[PDB]
Amino acid sequence: YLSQPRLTYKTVSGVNGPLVILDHVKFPRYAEIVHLTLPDGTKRSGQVLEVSGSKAVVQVFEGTSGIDAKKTSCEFTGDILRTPVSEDMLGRVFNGSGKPIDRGPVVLAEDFLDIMGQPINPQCRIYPEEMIQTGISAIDGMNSIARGQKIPIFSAAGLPHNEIAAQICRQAGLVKKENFAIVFAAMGVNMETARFFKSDFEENGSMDNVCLFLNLANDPTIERIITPRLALTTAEFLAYQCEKHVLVILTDMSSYAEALREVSAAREEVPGRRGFPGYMYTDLATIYERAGRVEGRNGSITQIPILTMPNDDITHPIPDLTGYITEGQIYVDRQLHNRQIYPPINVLPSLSRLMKSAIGEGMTRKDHADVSNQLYACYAIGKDVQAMKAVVGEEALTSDDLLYLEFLQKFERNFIAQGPYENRTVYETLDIGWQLLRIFPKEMLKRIPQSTLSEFYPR
Amino acid sequence: YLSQPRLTYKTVSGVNGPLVILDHVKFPRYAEIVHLTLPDGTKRSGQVLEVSGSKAVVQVFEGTSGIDAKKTSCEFTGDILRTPVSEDMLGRVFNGSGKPIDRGPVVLAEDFLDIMGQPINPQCRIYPEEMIQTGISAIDGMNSIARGQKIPIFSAAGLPHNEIAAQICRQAGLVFAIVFAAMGVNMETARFFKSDFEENGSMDNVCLFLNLANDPTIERIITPRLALTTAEFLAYQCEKHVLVILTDMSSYAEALREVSAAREEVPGRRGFPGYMYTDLATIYERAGRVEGRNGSITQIPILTMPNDDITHPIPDLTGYITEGQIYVDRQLHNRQIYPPINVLPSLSRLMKSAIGEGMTRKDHADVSNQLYACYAIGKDVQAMKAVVGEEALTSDDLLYLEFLQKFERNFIAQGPYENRTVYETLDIGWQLLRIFPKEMLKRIPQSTLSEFYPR
Amino acid sequence: QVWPVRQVRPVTEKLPANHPLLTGQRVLDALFPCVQGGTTAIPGAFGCGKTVISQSLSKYSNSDVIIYVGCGERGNEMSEVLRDFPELTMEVDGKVESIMKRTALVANTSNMPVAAREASIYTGITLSEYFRDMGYHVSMMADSTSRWAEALREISGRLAEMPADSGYPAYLGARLASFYERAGRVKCLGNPEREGSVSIVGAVSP
Amino acid sequence: SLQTSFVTLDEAIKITNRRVNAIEHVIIPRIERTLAYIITELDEREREE
């Protein structure tokens, strides 16, 4: 392996922003990690950015504020950035660089994996088959998530997408009729939501499932770019070598791309469309496409990215490319958060493109296809009656448009409304979903075929 | 004569995109012609874009793929690009470089003309006044063309602009060589102009320069130059009348933006280079009549506006050089109108002095000015009908909507084999002007209304 | 034999196309026909019922060879195609056969190199011109060619060339012109007088 | 009383429509075409920069 001793240069040729450029380097690698030690003693870390003959451009992680070109010693490693993975890191809280912050010890490695990762062979993938049960009714009843799906949650600043992400992590599991884990990556969080995540998951008793990667907002913007790659290499050890089912939640992927745009422009690159890098499509794809089931192993990786659309724009290139690689969306809505509904998940625009394979007999239950699209039709027909009632009044609505406004007062306050600690299992999000479909008679339910109307309506 | 022998180099000190940068060149000349020999033995030819002391920058026509630094010859001919011209190139099919693909021989030259053009004194030019009867009523009764007018067919992708043009070549005449130049066209368009000129039996008058879609891109810089130099030979030295058809001039500028990108000049409007105005003015201005010579060049280029935008840099800089334009629009194409010619943004800047008494007829200039104002008004009433509905329209505005149903079907819509004369077009145009009463034709004076209106 | 993918394979003559590419469908053969040698286009989205055509053209056409190109696609939308093509059947001479005795696939997911997705349109058109020179009638389906133009936009910015129209480079309509013109019924270059064809079935995503 | 509520709803419908059509064919296309010019001219200002 790497048994030769390491060279420790003090031949710094210049500092220019976050870049330290050395010279007379003996065979420098690309993307190799170095360890700079300052004059006073502060050890900083950095990654080699460009080599050219006897040169090396080093991008220091923690900035260059105090580096001189006379007394700074820059010890090279000779190997690229790798993570130590273990199965006993399920239950720890690491930061963006992979150091523990829960007063824990350093993780004893079972492997040292390169965090950039190799792609999966497209022949060796299987189509996603079973259900991941979250516990939130609005994304399990009508927007069900397969095993291996990549389905982002679309929201905005101020909306409670961070408590939806914390409620998924507390209650995610299988669809019971020993191999489940959650890798929660938090990029660009502040402190008061970092101690929301660190405190909620550790005293709601399910810290043992989750491996928490908390990358703060005041931490360096290069450490936000290796945070989802530390979280997905841990998930690819835990799933494709230990046969667990892993759910990978990446919180605020629009804050990854604001740290990628910052790292790109500080690499002296020229920006592309809307200022974002031109390689932004194949940079998110190296993150998102680390998913799916595999052939010959019993694990899987299902991803839930989370986005923050600026000014509720959908043509912004962070939601544009996420909707270009990932399969569907969830659409946390603002007009439901003002009306005090938790979780404020809109149903009408939301979609899971693999929902028709995660449902059915022997996966969830036999009527999960016919219930969901029936509640989807009656939610749309009510919301037309909801606006129409204001135009003509109550005395002008018949006994048809009152069944849809009386259903609509109970679909938002019983199906959508959950409360943050109420784990509705998927067998209980259908019995909720049926006792709203009994407000209508069997002569009105058009989306349900008659064979399961005979088996599930009369109770 | 060039009676010195030519220096063959093997000093290629850099290849970058479509450029080959030589060095140790002994007195290099600008706009020279080189002849590169690749390692495998094939030959491409190129042109010098810049000299600077001992180094030259060669613009290779067929692209620099496979060209290395070690064993690539570059024989410097020491001359600017001269084409061989003759009268026996009327009837041949050349490719975009000027090499024949008719399974025939090379051209045996009568002279060697510089393809870049040598500009004509404007003091000794004749103004094009004799009108070409083109048959098609939209570009004859309102947008008339004279012998010597540069006038493009603006169109877009899909519209029948190559059938509109081939109709003019069948129907052009007064009230005659063809030099065709295909730039980046597909195989089915070059199959169409061939089989139309074959069937018409005019193949002894057509000279086709075909640069297809898979022919190399930087040959399209010289393809309209190789065609127009033949035209300026056949018109000013052979005293023939020439009709030059430059289809997809959009494929000129995308191969000119390509050569200026990897050269890294200052880019202009929409990434197109700075010198795009004088470059299309190098091409479009080689037309017209001259004093003491009985030949003429009538130019009809063909464009494609991207996304049908007339304010793109290709139709907006063409409209500043050429004398009018013929607009082909997409909305009349969907309504099954052939030819789909929008007369509202169409123009002929030489129409004003080519029509009138003693050339065509007394009332030509008055009919077209009134057929303009009735189509321009009834298209505004149609956008007022979409607001207030069909019911709130006065009885002198159910006449302007009556006109549009009879203008774009009885005057515009023709059929691809009608040879409508300049008198048959006008006699259609007065039965449309009897739609109105006599006291609304406010662009036609009393002297012409008293004679031509009541029939 | 080894062929560079960006050079057109030489033919003797590029003949016109006078024979219908006959699917099993009643619409788009009684209404909107295609020929052996022609170039089509299809909107490929989620839930358009797109997988009628990609599987009818593979089983029921008069094509002898299918070359399926998947350029820059999703992860679990490429694995769906690789799952159901090795079980799709076809019956000539009564006996049944899998269609993987006459298809080749070019699978490029999003996770691939960006330059491998630019050269998946060109790899699948060069293989389709290798059987066309045998005299077969190849029908090629280039699924989601708008992902290929998303790959070319990166390669254009990889070399620092200036974006022209909506971020795409200058040569967007020209590499699409230098691809759909390699389709056509040709007369092959060779002695025993054959005549092949290539039909390109594109797929776009507005 | 029935023929006098007819000609009040016959005049109020024939005004609202001329006001749905005055948004569909006049106002909203003008706001869309200036949107398709801001996304064009700012592609130009990114390209020159």
mmCIF file with all atom_site columns, N, CA, C and O in Angstrom, chain B residues 411-432:
data_model
loop_
_atom_site.group_PDB
_atom_site.id
_atom_site.type_symbol
_atom_site.label_atom_id
_atom_site.label_alt_id
_atom_site.label_comp_id
_atom_site.label_asym_id
_atom_site.label_entity_id
_atom_site.label_seq_id
_atom_site.pdbx_PDB_ins_code
_atom_site.Cartn_x
_atom_site.Cartn_y
_atom_site.Cartn_z
_atom_site.occupancy
_atom_site.B_iso_or_equiv
_atom_site.pdbx_formal_charge
_atom_site.auth_seq_id
_atom_site.auth_comp_id
_atom_site.auth_asym_id
_atom_site.auth_atom_id
_atom_site.pdbx_PDB_model_num
ATOM 1  N N  . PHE B 1 411 ? -55.898 35.331 -54.552 1.00 0.00 ? 411 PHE B N  1
ATOM 2  C CA . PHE B 1 411 ? -54.721 36.080 -54.965 1.00 0.00 ? 411 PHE B CA 1
ATOM 3  C C  . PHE B 1 411 ? -53.431 35.420 -54.506 1.00 0.00 ? 411 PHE B C  1
ATOM 4  O O  . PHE B 1 411 ? -52.541 35.172 -55.322 1.00 0.00 ? 411 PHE B O  1
ATOM 5  N N  . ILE B 1 412 ? -53.311 35.136 -53.208 1.00 0.00 ? 412 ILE B N  1
ATOM 6  C CA . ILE B 1 412 ? -52.094 34.534 -52.674 1.00 0.00 ? 412 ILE B CA 1
ATOM 7  C C  . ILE B 1 412 ? -51.980 33.078 -53.104 1.00 0.00 ? 412 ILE B C  1
ATOM 8  O O  . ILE B 1 412 ? -51.002 32.690 -53.750 1.00 0.00 ? 412 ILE B O  1
ATOM 9  N N  . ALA B 1 413 ? -52.979 32.256 -52.762 1.00 0.00 ? 413 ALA B N  1
ATOM 10 C CA . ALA B 1 413 ? -52.943 30.818 -53.019 1.00 0.00 ? 413 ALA B CA 1
ATOM 11 C C  . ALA B 1 413 ? -52.989 30.543 -54.516 1.00 0.00 ? 413 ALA B C  1
ATOM 12 O O  . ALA B 1 413 ? -53.916 30.972 -55.207 1.00 0.00 ? 413 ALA B O  1
ATOM 13 N N  . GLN B 1 414 ? -51.976 29.847 -55.015 1.00 0.00 ? 414 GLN B N  1
ATOM 14 C CA . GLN B 1 414 ? -51.737 29.768 -56.448 1.00 0.00 ? 414 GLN B CA 1
ATOM 15 C C  . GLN B 1 414 ? -51.762 28.350 -56.997 1.00 0.00 ? 414 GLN B C  1
ATOM 16 O O  . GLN B 1 414 ? -52.443 28.090 -57.994 1.00 0.00 ? 414 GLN B O  1
ATOM 17 N N  . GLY B 1 415 ? -51.046 27.424 -56.376 1.00 0.00 ? 415 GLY B N  1
ATOM 18 C CA . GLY B 1 415 ? -50.797 26.138 -56.977 1.00 0.00 ? 415 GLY B CA 1
ATOM 19 C C  . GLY B 1 415 ? -49.471 26.166 -57.705 1.00 0.00 ? 415 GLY B C  1
ATOM 20 O O  . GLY B 1 415 ? -49.143 27.134 -58.396 1.00 0.00 ? 415 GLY B O  1
ATOM 21 N N  . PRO B 1 416 ? -48.687 25.090 -57.591 1.00 0.00 ? 416 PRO B N  1
ATOM 22 C CA . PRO B 1 416 ? -47.276 25.158 -57.988 1.00 0.00 ? 416 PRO B CA 1
ATOM 23 C C  . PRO B 1 416 ? -47.008 25.146 -59.484 1.00 0.00 ? 416 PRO B C  1
ATOM 24 O O  . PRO B 1 416 ? -45.846 25.125 -59.896 1.00 0.00 ? 416 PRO B O  1
ATOM 25 N N  . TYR B 1 417 ? -48.048 25.164 -60.310 1.00 0.00 ? 417 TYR B N  1
ATOM 26 C CA . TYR B 1 417 ? -47.845 25.148 -61.751 1.00 0.00 ? 417 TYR B CA 1
ATOM 27 C C  . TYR B 1 417 ? -48.763 26.133 -62.458 1.00 0.00 ? 417 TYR B C  1
ATOM 28 O O  . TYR B 1 417 ? -49.205 25.878 -63.583 1.00 0.00 ? 417 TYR B O  1
ATOM 29 N N  . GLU B 1 418 ? -49.061 27.256 -61.817 1.00 0.00 ? 418 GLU B N  1
ATOM 30 C CA . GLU B 1 418 ? -49.745 28.362 -62.466 1.00 0.00 ? 418 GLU B CA 1
ATOM 31 C C  . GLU B 1 418 ? -48.722 29.407 -62.882 1.00 0.00 ? 418 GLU B C  1
ATOM 32 O O  . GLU B 1 418 ? -47.933 29.878 -62.057 1.00 0.00 ? 418 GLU B O  1
ATOM 33 N N  . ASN B 1 419 ? -48.722 29.741 -64.160 1.00 0.00 ? 419 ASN B N  1
ATOM 34 C CA . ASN B 1 419 ? -47.874 30.781 -64.717 1.00 0.00 ? 419 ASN B CA 1
ATOM 35 C C  . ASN B 1 419 ? -48.764 32.008 -64.907 1.00 0.00 ? 419 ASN B C  1
ATOM 36 O O  . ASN B 1 419 ? -49.185 32.321 -66.021 1.00 0.00 ? 419 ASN B O  1
ATOM 37 N N  . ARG B 1 420 ? -49.065 32.694 -63.806 1.00 0.00 ? 420 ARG B N  1
ATOM 38 C CA . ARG B 1 420 ? -49.954 33.850 -63.837 1.00 0.00 ? 420 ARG B CA 1
ATOM 39 C C  . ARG B 1 420 ? -49.186 35.086 -64.287 1.00 0.00 ? 420 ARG B C  1
ATOM 40 O O  . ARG B 1 420 ? -48.215 35.482 -63.641 1.00 0.00 ? 420 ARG B O  1
ATOM 41 N N  . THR B 1 421 ? -49.645 35.718 -65.365 1.00 0.00 ? 421 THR B N  1
ATOM 42 C CA . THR B 1 421 ? -48.965 36.876 -65.932 1.00 0.00 ? 421 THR B CA 1
ATOM 43 C C  . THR B 1 421 ? -49.095 38.095 -65.025 1.00 0.00 ? 421 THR B C  1
ATOM 44 O O  . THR B 1 421 ? -49.748 38.063 -63.982 1.00 0.00 ? 421 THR B O  1
ATOM 45 N N  . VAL B 1 422 ? -48.467 39.197 -65.437 1.00 0.00 ? 422 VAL B N  1
ATOM 46 C CA . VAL B 1 422 ? -48.568 40.396 -64.617 1.00 0.00 ? 422 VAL B CA 1
ATOM 47 C C  . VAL B 1 422 ? -49.903 41.088 -64.851 1.00 0.00 ? 422 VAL B C  1
ATOM 48 O O  . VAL B 1 422 ? -50.332 41.889 -64.013 1.00 0.00 ? 422 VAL B O  1
ATOM 49 N N  . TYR B 1 423 ? -50.586 40.782 -65.955 1.00 0.00 ? 423 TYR B N  1
ATOM 50 C CA . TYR B 1 423 ? -51.925 41.292 -66.191 1.00 0.00 ? 423 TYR B CA 1
ATOM 51 C C  . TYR B 1 423 ? -52.993 40.420 -65.560 1.00 0.00 ? 423 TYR B C  1
ATOM 52 O O  . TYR B 1 423 ? -53.985 40.956 -65.062 1.00 0.00 ? 423 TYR B O  1
ATOM 53 N N  . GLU B 1 424 ? -52.811 39.097 -65.557 1.00 0.00 ? 424 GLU B N  1
ATOM 54 C CA . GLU B 1 424 ? -53.716 38.203 -64.853 1.00 0.00 ? 424 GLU B CA 1
ATOM 55 C C  . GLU B 1 424 ? -53.676 38.386 -63.348 1.00 0.00 ? 424 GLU B C  1
ATOM 56 O O  . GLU B 1 424 ? -54.689 38.141 -62.693 1.00 0.00 ? 424 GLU B O  1
ATOM 57 N N  . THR B 1 425 ? -52.540 38.805 -62.785 1.00 0.00 ? 425 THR B N  1
ATOM 58 C CA . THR B 1 425 ? -52.480 39.097 -61.359 1.00 0.00 ? 425 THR B CA 1
ATOM 59 C C  . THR B 1 425 ? -53.272 40.350 -61.022 1.00 0.00 ? 425 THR B C  1
ATOM 60 O O  . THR B 1 425 ? -54.050 40.351 -60.061 1.00 0.00 ? 425 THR B O  1
ATOM 61 N N  . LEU B 1 426 ? -53.118 41.407 -61.822 1.00 0.00 ? 426 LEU B N  1
ATOM 62 C CA . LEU B 1 426 ? -53.833 42.656 -61.591 1.00 0.00 ? 426 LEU B CA 1
ATOM 63 C C  . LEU B 1 426 ? -55.333 42.515 -61.802 1.00 0.00 ? 426 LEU B C  1
ATOM 64 O O  . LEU B 1 426 ? -56.112 43.100 -61.045 1.00 0.00 ? 426 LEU B O  1
ATOM 65 N N  . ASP B 1 427 ? -55.751 41.745 -62.808 1.00 0.00 ? 427 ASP B N  1
ATOM 66 C CA . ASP B 1 427 ? -57.168 41.504 -63.047 1.00 0.00 ? 427 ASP B CA 1
ATOM 67 C C  . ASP B 1 427 ? -57.807 40.659 -61.956 1.00 0.00 ? 427 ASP B C  1
ATOM 68 O O  . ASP B 1 427 ? -59.027 40.720 -61.782 1.00 0.00 ? 427 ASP B O  1
ATOM 69 N N  . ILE B 1 428 ? -57.019 39.858 -61.234 1.00 0.00 ? 428 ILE B N  1
ATOM 70 C CA . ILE B 1 428 ? -57.491 39.288 -59.975 1.00 0.00 ? 428 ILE B CA 1
ATOM 71 C C  . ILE B 1 428 ? -57.591 40.376 -58.915 1.00 0.00 ? 428 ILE B C  1
ATOM 72 O O  . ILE B 1 428 ? -58.540 40.411 -58.125 1.00 0.00 ? 428 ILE B O  1
ATOM 73 N N  . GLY B 1 429 ? -56.656 41.325 -58.930 1.00 0.00 ? 429 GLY B N  1
ATOM 74 C CA . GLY B 1 429 ? -56.579 42.295 -57.855 1.00 0.00 ? 429 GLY B CA 1
ATOM 75 C C  . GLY B 1 429 ? -57.643 43.371 -57.904 1.00 0.00 ? 429 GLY B C  1
ATOM 76 O O  . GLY B 1 429 ? -57.814 44.114 -56.935 1.00 0.00 ? 429 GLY B O  1
ATOM 77 N N  . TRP B 1 430 ? -58.370 43.483 -59.018 1.00 0.00 ? 430 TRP B N  1
ATOM 78 C CA . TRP B 1 430 ? -59.432 44.482 -59.079 1.00 0.00 ? 430 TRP B CA 1
ATOM 79 C C  . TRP B 1 430 ? -60.773 43.884 -58.695 1.00 0.00 ? 430 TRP B C  1
ATOM 80 O O  . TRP B 1 430 ? -61.657 44.599 -58.214 1.00 0.00 ? 430 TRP B O  1
ATOM 81 N N  . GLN B 1 431 ? -60.954 42.580 -58.890 1.00 0.00 ? 431 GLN B N  1
ATOM 82 C CA . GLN B 1 431 ? -62.179 41.950 -58.423 1.00 0.00 ? 431 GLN B CA 1
ATOM 83 C C  . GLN B 1 431 ? -62.182 41.760 -56.916 1.00 0.00 ? 431 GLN B C  1
ATOM 84 O O  . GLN B 1 431 ? -63.243 41.530 -56.332 1.00 0.00 ? 431 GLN B O  1
ATOM 85 N N  . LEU B 1 432 ? -61.016 41.849 -56.280 1.00 0.00 ? 432 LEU B N  1
ATOM 86 C CA . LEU B 1 432 ? -60.921 42.018 -54.843 1.00 0.00 ? 432 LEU B CA 1
ATOM 87 C C  . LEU B 1 432 ? -61.132 43.457 -54.414 1.00 0.00 ? 432 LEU B C  1
ATOM 88 O O  . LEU B 1 432 ? -61.537 43.693 -53.275 1.00 0.00 ? 432 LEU B O  1
#
